[PDB]
Amino acid sequence: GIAVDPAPRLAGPPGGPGNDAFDLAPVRSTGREMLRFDFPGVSIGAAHYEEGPTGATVIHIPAGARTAVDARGGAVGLSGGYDFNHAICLAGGAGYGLEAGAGVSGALLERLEHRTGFAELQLVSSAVIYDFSARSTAVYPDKALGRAALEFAVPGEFPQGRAGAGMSASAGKVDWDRTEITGQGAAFRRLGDVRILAVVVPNPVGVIVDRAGTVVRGNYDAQTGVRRHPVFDYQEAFAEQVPTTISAIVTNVRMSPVELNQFAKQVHSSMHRGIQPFHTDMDGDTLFAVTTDEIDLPTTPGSSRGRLSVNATALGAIASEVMWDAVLEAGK
Amino acid sequence: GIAVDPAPRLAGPPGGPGNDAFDLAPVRSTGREMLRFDFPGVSIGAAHYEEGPTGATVIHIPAGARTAVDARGGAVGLSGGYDFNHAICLAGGAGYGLEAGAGVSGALLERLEHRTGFAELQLVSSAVIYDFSARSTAVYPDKALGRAALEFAVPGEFPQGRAGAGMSASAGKVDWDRTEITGQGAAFRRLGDVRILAVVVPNPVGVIVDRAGTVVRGNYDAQTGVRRHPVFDYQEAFAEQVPTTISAIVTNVRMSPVELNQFAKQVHSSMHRGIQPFHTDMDGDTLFAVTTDEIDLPTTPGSSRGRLSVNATALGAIASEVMWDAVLEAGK
Amino acid sequence: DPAPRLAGPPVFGGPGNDAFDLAPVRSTGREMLRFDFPGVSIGAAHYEEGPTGATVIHIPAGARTAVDARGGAVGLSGGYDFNHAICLAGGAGYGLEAGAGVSGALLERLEHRTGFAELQLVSSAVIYDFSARSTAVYPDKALGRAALEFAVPGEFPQGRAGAGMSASAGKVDWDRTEITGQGAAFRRLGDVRILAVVVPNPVGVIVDRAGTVVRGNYDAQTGVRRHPVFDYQEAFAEQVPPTTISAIVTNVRMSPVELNQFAKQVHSSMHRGIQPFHTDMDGDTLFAVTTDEIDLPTTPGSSRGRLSVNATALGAIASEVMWDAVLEAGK
Amino acid sequence: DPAPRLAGPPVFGGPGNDAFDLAPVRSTGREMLRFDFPGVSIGAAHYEEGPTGATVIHIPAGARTAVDARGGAVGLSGGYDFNHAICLAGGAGYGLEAGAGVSGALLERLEHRTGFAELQLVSSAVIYDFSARSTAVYPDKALGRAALEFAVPGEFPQGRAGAGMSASAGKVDWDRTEITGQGAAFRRLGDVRILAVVVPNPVGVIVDRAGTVVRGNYDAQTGVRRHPVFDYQEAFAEQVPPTTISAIVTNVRMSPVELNQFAKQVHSSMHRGIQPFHTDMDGDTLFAVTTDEIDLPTTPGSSRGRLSVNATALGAIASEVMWDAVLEAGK
Ligand SMILES: [Cl-]
Ligand SMILES: [Cl-]
Ligand SMILES: [Cl-]
Ligand SMILES: [Cl-]
């Protein structure tokens, strides 16, 4: 059970200098703690500019992996969106921060010795959060930051908390006076040979909610010292006036394109448990579902626990709980 | 707080005669209780065949209303899917049960005196659940049943429980030995002049879960007398072997097509709180978001409860809680 | 240029299904196309009282399907990724009932078995053909049942037959709209089979490969058909300021991604023979169906070129089979 | 038939961006199109070292946009429903970097303000143009910045210019692929303005309105271009068994649903001038952009017909402006 910290992390009231105002040196992000996991073939790197503060987080899978993209929000900021990726790049800096993905792409082209055959094309999908209201600069994750995240990527490690894309992520935006800093978060599970890793950068309009139904991050009211569910503010506002989260889930279980896409949708929708409201017009919510195609499900779905108990739906259910864990690490 | 009944309603272990084996007479469904609400312009009718047992539930809005359709599942059964509807028809009988919608359509053409100008076209969207494993007949909602639901429709009333499309709906299908009968369910809220009505026929692969996180319908294990979360069965199955919900939300608040579509997605995803897992490959999950375009939101979204507190996202949040209530009435 | 078939002014006011004792007629159209495609049957039925009809493609074994619903006024039921039949019909929204007739009849043939892997799946799409006649009659359950019962292997009745009974083209102004028809074409290449079925009811006109307008937007004042774009641009100079439903069925194995992209390609290709097309006023809908009997080779090469045997290539061949079908429809 | 411009065999092995001191060149192409469209600017820049380039449409006030991404190999960034610029580029995936250069330069012009309603939005799409040259050079940040800086109102450099520097057509076999170009066209009708920009790098060929293949799939053995479908069907007889990126910019107000359906229509219409099109091998992507300055009348009638002034009608006019653009590209 994740020990979330009850103390407030109000982001504060929302120009400022841009990138070239500074001599920007990428910092390898360590965050508050390192998650360690065992998943050969998948590396994660995180880098930030302290001058933002803002960052990027890169998932490198050099073999390339089949990918489904679930771009559910109404304000999505997305590059590539490919159904096969060598890397995924998550970044702050809103639409400007997609540039970090170009830094990754360029650097992978260089590792391939600038080979450009169709089958050699290095494919990176990027998505962004708007993290500018959480700080007083206009610094964004650029080319050099994306390359540095890629260079910093190591297998079996993830920096929890204020790190990479999560450096100035924040939640709960009915009013900015009640918005709190979140983080990024990851969690991982091995069942048999099955491996599931979840990565998340929740910058939601809504709030982070734990399995008991407590609001644990975002919409902190300084006048009461309490975090209410946004619906309460929304209903009072209506009674008076009338009259983004970016994520990845990576598994080693083979799924067809159709399965993987429905998997993506299932795990994504499940995140409305831990973030509320979710998939709003104001959110750019995007989830990447990625399989390394290492392990087959059985032909038939049966087990002592039910006829319909082993299949891609079952794995979605299990992966959804890994994701919830990741959202809670980010809000911790 | 909805007093769900803890007693089990196991559906039982899953041919049988079809429609014409019987002299099928539509029954006006009354269910276990009538919800009463005030929403001029929207009528609901429910009819069933006792011989199924199976039913249909029809939302008649004779003025016609702008509609967004969120067909999220992997096994959707849908007819029309129109962005403007005179009626919505929900039915059992799987794909065969879309015929009820044709019964509605034909009967509306007759009220219009068979006028067929472009602007006079009567538009009905239909969606279905597969409810055949809950009974031992092959009877399905037909033309005559849809017409009878339409004829039975009255304003300001909804039959809760085993009624209309919810007559043989059931939940929790990791194994059919643990599947329970659900129902249909509705709930309604008036804030100021704003009216929100929710209607739901949850026939999920997953289970119905209340606001405290208790599983309250589906995946009842007769050997333990308890309902576990499906994830527990799924994880045990994996450790061992390796190595549909149809709904409507109707409001009187004007929304543009773009808003209404994102509204649909938001409220739909929120239902993964009350049904888990949701939006799976095995589900045909479909939500209809409908506005009668009677009341404007304010131009600006501000209030004493926050700068971003009155808008279509806020209304999604409020409508999501009306929907949860409706899912709980269905599982009650 | 062919003789005109102007629809004439729409005479709304007329009797609907309940006013008649409606008798299904097996459509024979103007001529029969004969082809060899084992496991595919086609049945066509109409009511003279409309006149209006439905055309059903029956594939008993069931076949994977991709759906490209492109217009802004689509009228579609099911849209399944696996189908035992496809139902095309007039009657606008109301003709979606014909498909329920097919679904019901198939269930009876399956002796009312209902296990999740035995459900009989029918996708249906419709055209609005009310303006081309003076009744409110639409293809109902019984007419869908009749078309399935009338289905035989390797025949297709061309012209005013089934769903093509009252299809029409060229709707810049109703005074220049012409009756079309339904149309089919078939090509076999080694073991590769491609059947194209089409029911054009376009806002636009049918155009042949020389760029001639061959059906729709015929001006009785001048004796000549015009491309709609000439009417449109003149309309704009003056005032500012002052559906097609189709199936492509083949026996080549394609993955769901491949078949989907193939459906999109062939569908777009039809803007060569119908113009304009995929408009907000159309409900254009194409079903791509494969019986999954023949493999494409593992690599795409041949004496005709390195990227010459693949799904895009089939796309291109099928696009011509489809253009032939549209032209039969308009003939 | 025009003289051939065969690309020649792809000579992979060559130097990339880091091997050069890359100097942006303002593209002038083969000739300048001049037009009058207040509030729209176009800038084009290339590196000779590729050769490869980027073309940027700048709309300072920002404009509503619909995106139709149709191919099975799309390479797209942003895809926003509101844009201050559109960036088209070679370099395949890698050329999406040019758009980040534009985004960065716009931010500087906005003095680094970052409120949610002042974000500078750039959508970018790319073609793979590596096979048409012998280097790995791609349009980078600086090249995107250069094209935005080079932007002026009412000019468009036709031909090998900007993103069209190494665009090519006709990819049944690389030995028959021909260099294309980029192309634009402009039509004004009363106050109604329509600009069409296109960068065809199709697997298919460019075809004119008479149905002639005018660029791509040229056989040096015979001196003649072929429609790909002839190669494909012969390939199949033998062996079984044995991208275009574009913008349509107008000043007419359309609702988001209207503009979207309009984008889809115009995009499909391009299967008349490029064949095949919307294939799984293409990343075909079209941006429909409106400056929202002129209203369509409330009802659609005119002396040219009852349904003659509306968004479908604009669709049809814009489809011809676009075909002119493709032909300029291939010229
Ligand atoms: Cl576990
Ligand atoms: Cl309330
Ligand atoms: Cl049969
Ligand atoms: Cl500017």
Numbering used by the authors:
A (entry chain A), B (entry chain A): 15 to 28, 31 to 259, 267 to 355
C (entry chain B), D (entry chain B): 19 to 260, 267 to 355
Sentences from the paper on this structure:
Nylon hydrolase (NylC) is one of the three enzymes responsible for the endo-type degradation of the by-products of nylon-6 manufacture (cyclic and linear oligomers of 6-aminohexanoate (Ahx) with a degree of polymerization greater than three) and various aliphatic nylons (e.g., nylon-6 and nylon-66). However, the post-translational autocleavage of the nascent polypeptide between Asn266 and Thr267 generates an active enzyme with an α subunit (27 kDa) and a β subunit (9 kDa). Based on the X-ray-crystallographic structure of NylCA, we reported that four αβ heterodimers (molecules A-D) form a doughnut-shaped quaternary structure. In addition, we proposed that the nucleophilic N-terminal residue Thr267 in the β subunit functions as a catalytic residue for either autocleavage (from precursor to active enzyme) or substrate hydrolysis.
Among the various mutants obtained from wild-type NylCp2, which differ in thermostability, a single D122G mutation drastically improves the thermostability by 24 °C9. However, the D2 symmetry was partly altered by mutations at position 122. Plotting the protein stability (Tm value) estimated from the CD analyses against the distance between the two monomer molecules revealed that the protein stability exhibited an inverse correlation with the a2/a1 ratio (index of symmetry). In other words, the ratio changed from 0.979 to 1.197 from the wild-type (Asp122) to the mutant (Arg122, Lys122, Val122, and Gly122) enzyme, although this value should be equal to one for a perfectly symmetric structure. In wild-type NylCp2, Lys159-NH3+ (located on helix α2 in molecule A) was 2.87 Å away from Glu115-Oε1− (located on helix α1 in molecule D). In contrast, the distance was reduced to 2.65 Å in the thermostable Gly122 enzyme. We suggest that the electrostatic effect between the two residues will enhance the subunit binding around Gly122 of helix α1.
